[PDB]
Amino acid sequence: TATGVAITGSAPAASMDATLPAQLPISAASVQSTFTLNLKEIEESKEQVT
Amino acid sequence: RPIIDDVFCSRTRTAAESAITTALGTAVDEGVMYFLKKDDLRFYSTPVVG
């Protein structure tokens, strides 16, 4: 604050700027995907697809 | 032409041969001969990795 006082003033009340946190979390989740492919499908798909 | 004998040799009687099954009880039919030709039957199995 920068309030206005007289010349024979009284040096007014205290003031100071405040800083704050943000805390922005990262660690509980994840995106994922699965395949579930066989071991015979990957064998018969190399003489039978071009 | 040699006569090879297997212990595990049989044949399942078909559904058209059903009056021959009730008279004998079973359908295992251990009386077979199987006049086969040698280089005409083949066996297969997949070469899956590992």
Give Cα separations from B22 to B9, B15, B35 (angstroms): 21, 11, 27
DSSP reduced 3-state for A48 = coil
CA distance linking residue A39 with residue A34, whole number of Å: 15
A40/A34 Cα distance (integer angstroms): 18
B32 contacts B17 by C-beta, under 8 angstroms: no
Q: Which two tokens stand for residue B6?
A: 């297997």
Nearest CA in chain B to A40: B48
Asked whether the beta carbons of B12 and B27 are under 8 A apart, the reply is: yes
Declared resolution, Å: 3.5
| Experimental approach taken | cryo-EM
User: Residue A15 region, left (φ>0) first, then alpha (ψ -120 to 50), else beta?
Assistant: beta
Residue A29, token pair as written in the block: 């989740």
Q: Which of residues 20-39 of A touch B (CB under 8 A)?
A: 39
Question: Across the interface, do A44 and B47 touch by the CB < 8 Å criterion?
Answer: no
- Is B46 in the A-facing interface, judged by CB distances under 8 Å? yes
